[PDB]
Amino acid sequence: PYTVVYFPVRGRCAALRMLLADQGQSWKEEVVTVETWQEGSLKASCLYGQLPKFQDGDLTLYQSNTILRHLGRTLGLYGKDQQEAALVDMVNDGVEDLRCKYISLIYTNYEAGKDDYVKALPGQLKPFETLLSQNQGGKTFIVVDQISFADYNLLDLLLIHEVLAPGCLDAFPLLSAYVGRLSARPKLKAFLASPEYVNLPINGNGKQ
Amino acid sequence: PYTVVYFPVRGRCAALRMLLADQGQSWKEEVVTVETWQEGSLKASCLYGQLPKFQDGDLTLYQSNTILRHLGRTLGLYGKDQQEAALVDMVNDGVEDLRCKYISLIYTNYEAGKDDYVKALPGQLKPFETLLSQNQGGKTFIVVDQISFADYNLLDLLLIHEVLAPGCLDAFPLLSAYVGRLSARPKLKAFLASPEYVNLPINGNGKQ
Ligand SMILES: N[C@@H](CCC(=O)N[C@@H](CS)C(=O)NCC(=O)O)C(=O)O
Ligand SMILES: N[C@@H](CCC(=O)N[C@@H](CS)C(=O)NCC(=O)O)C(=O)O
């Protein structure tokens, strides 16, 4: 039913994969090697010439966040009403912004900018700690009483930053208990421990 | 009912403003000067320390695309069903990606990178021409049979690029007729000609 076409890395597919796994959904991984990509055919066929590419039946989607919102809508991980939907988006857009900065660091200037980035990290993470503190004392999910696609995206963002800068969550008790709690969810826990996840690099240039 | 808190520029609020105007909605513009911003209070109160800030009743939102999707949901500019909603997102995410590149050029290296950017423009615009060609011959809207929040965002993206690189749409007949057509919509036409729009700079550093 579901098919994700992507390079052999976690990157922009980690979140949607966690979502599918934690939601007990089944999907096909179509791995695209750098050689196959350099060939040019596939790329030229991609709407924006990039991956991931997602297939739900004959519905073909591009853009990682479009995929997340699509699954969020179809799997009921988008809040209970319009107001909640807006809050979920607000969280996901914030996650996306930080992911872009992370991606820029990793691929553009890991060596030179890693110091400043880590220094500015606390200020970038604080918003999510604040969101949690304003939602049932940070005991449930990021913004509503049920898990949303934004939670999976946030969870990944947090996991990869703990690798980039160990202990970055030590200053944020809600985020820490949040990561621990969500990572404990049965299907998600099993997935995160699987080779399918563990044996794929976070990024494509060996940096993390 | 609606209130947009932003700097005195079109920037990331141009699209939502066109949407509100074309939809016959009323809103309050709360202008934030650079001096008021440098003061720090407001910024510290912003979820991600940035503007725009949007208020719909006591619902406070941040993130321009969250605002667009919120209005799209509440005003019925998000398609008719889930599949269409996904297609609308796919378009908006593409617009967002190019906007980010545009924003980087304008604020990061207008002088040095303007040449390469313009050179790469055609390849960045082509995806939208393609989207139009696959939707009722490009006679209606960007992806579905009704206007969506993504249309307004795309329209703005196109308008500002024609300023950055005059004639960039000459190679794309569907996009051209698209811009002309949407700009002709009564309420939108009146808005675009108003001082409210015309007398605000596109960006904040005087570059365009
Ligand atoms: N906004 C897109 C970004 C997609 C993207 O950056 N794709 C990269 C891999 S992470 C890619 O296809 N790189 C190869 C290329 O551009 O040819 C999304 O969120 O899906
Ligand atoms: N992802 C955000 C980006 C917001 C943004 O870049 N805001 C700028 C002005 S357009 C800002 O607040 N700059 C001041 C600062 O960050 O200190 C959105 O789409 O709204």
UniProtKB/Swiss-Prot annotation, chains A, B:
* Residues where Phosphothreonine is found: 60
Tell me the residues on which N6-acetyllysine occurs.
126
Q: Spell out the protein name for this chain.
A: Glutathione S-transferase P
Question: Start and end of every GST N-terminal domain?
Answer: 1-79
- One Gene Ontology term, aspect cellular component: nucleus
One term of GO molecular function = S-nitrosoglutathione binding
**Highest taxon in the source lineage:** Eukaryota
Task: Recite the lineage of the species.
Answer: Eukaryota, Metazoa, Chordata, Craniata, Vertebrata
- Gene name, please? GSTP1
